[PDB]
Amino acid sequence: AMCMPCFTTDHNMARKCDDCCGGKGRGKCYGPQCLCR
């Protein structure tokens, strides 16, 4: 399912997840998975 992981130890996890999902507000970190909205 995931575009990429979300690791809480990576304080930039939300910006990375957005990058994976195509830009601002497009990705959500839900537990350990970045999911494209």
Name a few traits of the molecule:
globular, three-stranded antiparallel β-sheet, alpha+beta, 37 residues, 3 strands
Structural class: alpha+beta
Distance between the termini: 11 Å
Q: What's the domain count?
A: 1
Using only C-alpha atoms, the radius of gyration works out to 8 Å
Order of helices and strands: EHEE
What percentage of amino acids are in beta strands? 25-35%
Spatial strand arrangement across the major sheet: 1-3-2
* Total strand segments: 3
What is the helical fraction, as a range of percent?
Answer: 10-25%
Disulfide bonds: 3-20, 6-29, 17-34, 21-36
Subcellular location: Secreted
Keywords: Chloride channel impairing toxin, Disulfide bond, Ion channel impairing toxin, Knottin, Metalloenzyme inhibitor, Metalloprotease inhibitor, Neurotoxin, Protease inhibitor, Secreted, Toxin, Voltage-gated chloride channel impairing toxin
Family: Belongs to the short scorpion toxin superfamily. Chloride channel inhibitor family.
